[PDB]
Ligand binder design. Structure first.
Ligand code: SF4
Ligand SMILES: [Mg+2]
Ligand SMILES: [Mg+2]
Length: 237
């Protein structure tokens, strides 16, 4: 009996579409994501590096008390750093934010990313990942959620469930963005449902430590259960 992770890409894509159908029945069109507007999502991410959810939201809203975006680009970095002080090491985050805002204003349009809509996917991605503090996961999130482009953001929840099941072998999170997208159709609503359903399943069942495999709708095709049964270890390295 071969593990899922060693199976051909075509077999692993059939597996992932089965996974998506099962998660759709457990969770439907349920959405545990922030669903923010583009500028909010981008800046939030920068503030949300080595930082809890409650502290990032607090850091974002106090940031926005400095003024609108144009005011934050011009506010002295001392003021920006003190406002976001409840996030991860505000000294480093404050310049990345200012520079990101600066580079967005210079783009065609106001503090808005209307051009990412009708741009080649690879090019839209590369433009966001060139912004300081923005990685492929945040760029994929903004492109999928706000502009309905066919990209698939892979957060820790998505990465953990998909790896444990064996839809992909173990690899870095950035490499997993290309690997899973390669198994998926260019169908933005499909990708967004798949994403939010992974978040629900990772938060509720396939948890970082002690997953609840006995309540898991995927257990019968899960590599991790096949290997460890009731003793699936914490998602490591
Ligand atoms: S069987 Fe366990 S490890 Fe596998 S997907 Fe379900 S909860 Fe995660
Ligand atoms: Mg602009
Ligand atoms: Mg970057």
């Amino acid at each position: 009996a071969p593990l899922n992770a060693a199976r051909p890409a075509e077999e692993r894509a059939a597996l992932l579409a089965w996974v998506k159908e099962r998660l759709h029945e457990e969770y439907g069109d349920q959405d545990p994501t922030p669903r923010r507007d583009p500028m909010h999502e981008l800046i939030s991410t920068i503030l949300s590096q080595r930082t809890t959810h409650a502290d990032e939201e607090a850091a974002y809203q106090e940031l926005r008390t400095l003024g609108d975006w144009d005011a934050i680009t011009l506010a002295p970095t001392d003021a920006v750093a003190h406002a976001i002080r409840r996030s991860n090491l505000p000294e480093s985050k404050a310049p990345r934010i200012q520079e990101t805002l600066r580079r967005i204003k210079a783009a065609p349009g106001g503090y808005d990313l209307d051009f990412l809509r009708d741009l080649p996917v690879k090019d839209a991605l590369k433009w966001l990942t060139d912004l300081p503090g923005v990685g492929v996961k945040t760029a994929s999130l903004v492109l999928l959620f706000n502009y309905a482009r066919p990209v698939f953001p892979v957060d820790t929840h998505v990465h953990r469930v998909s790896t444990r099941v064996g839809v992909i072998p173990r690899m870095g999170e950035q490499a997993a963005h290309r690997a899973l997208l390669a198994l998926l159709p260019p169908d933005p609503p499909y990708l967004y449902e798949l994403h939010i359903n992974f978040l629900s399943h990772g938060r509720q069942v396939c948890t970082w430590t002690r997953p609840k495999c006995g309540k898991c709708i995927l257990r019968e095709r899960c590599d991790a259960y096949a290997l460890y049964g009731d003793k699936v270890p914490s998602f490591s390295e």
